[PDB]
Every structure is written in C-alpha cells, then in structure tokens.
C-alpha cells in the first residue's frame, strides 16, 4: 500500500538526482540571458506584490517591477534559475552567480 508510494518517491528522487548536473561541470553561459532577466524581474515583482519580504531600501516607490529591478541592481534576489538541457538534465545557477548583459 504505502510501500508502493515509497518506491515511487524513491524512483522520482533518484531520477531527479541523476538529471541534475553538479556545479563543478556546468557548461552553460556565465551571462544571464535576456529571457532569464525578464522572468526573474517578473517573478520577483509578483512575490513583492504578494507581500514578500524585500531586501532593498524603498525610495518611496510603489511599482513592484521597479522594486524588483532595484533588487536585481543590488543583487538581492533570492531566486535560482534551473536551465534545462534538451534531454531533461538541468543545471542550477543562482541569480547573484550570473552577470547581467
């Protein structure tokens, strides 16, 4: 009964761990792509709009997208990009580990 679920969970975790590419050998672009920058800005703006904690000084600002742009400028966005290779294997680059433009 439950052991069927335990087997399925074990298999899912094993396939996930096999798909992940370890940090020491990721061969993708060091630069943040324009698509990644846009989606980081949009998602961080959504999170701020939904009352998430903010890591920058609000200069009396009200635009969530502007606040997210400020966070990206000061590299304070707690997000991670999971770049997907065609075979389903993926790498993980943190936002502060990437260079904009």
């Amino acid at each position: 009964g439950p052991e069927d679920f335990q087997q399925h969970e074990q298999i899912r975790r094993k396939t996930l761990k096999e798909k992940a590419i370890p940090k020491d050998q990721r061969a993708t672009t060091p630069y943040m792509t324009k698509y990644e920058r846009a989606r980081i800005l949009g998602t961080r703006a959504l999170q701020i709009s939904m009352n998430a904690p903010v890591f920058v000084d609000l200069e009396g600002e009200t635009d969530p997208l502007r606040i997210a742009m400020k966070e990206l400028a000061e590299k304070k966005i707690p997000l991670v990009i999971r770049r997907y290779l065609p075979d389903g294997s993926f790498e993980d680059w943190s936002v502060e580990e990437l260079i904009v433009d």
């Binding site: 009964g1 439950p2 052991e3 679920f5 335990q6 969970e9």
Partner: peptide, 19 residues
C-alpha cells in the same frame, strides 16, 4: 478548500507504528 490552506496531495510514507 483551496491550494492555500490544505495540502494538494497526501501520501503515507510507512505503515502506522503504534507508540
């Protein structure tokens, strides 16, 4: 009854162990 107050799916890890 939303994805904000109740879990999406619940599964049992093991058989219930009496304490």
């Amino acid at each position: 009854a939303t994805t904000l107050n109740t879990p999406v799916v619940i599964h049992a890890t093991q058989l219930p162990q009496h304490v």
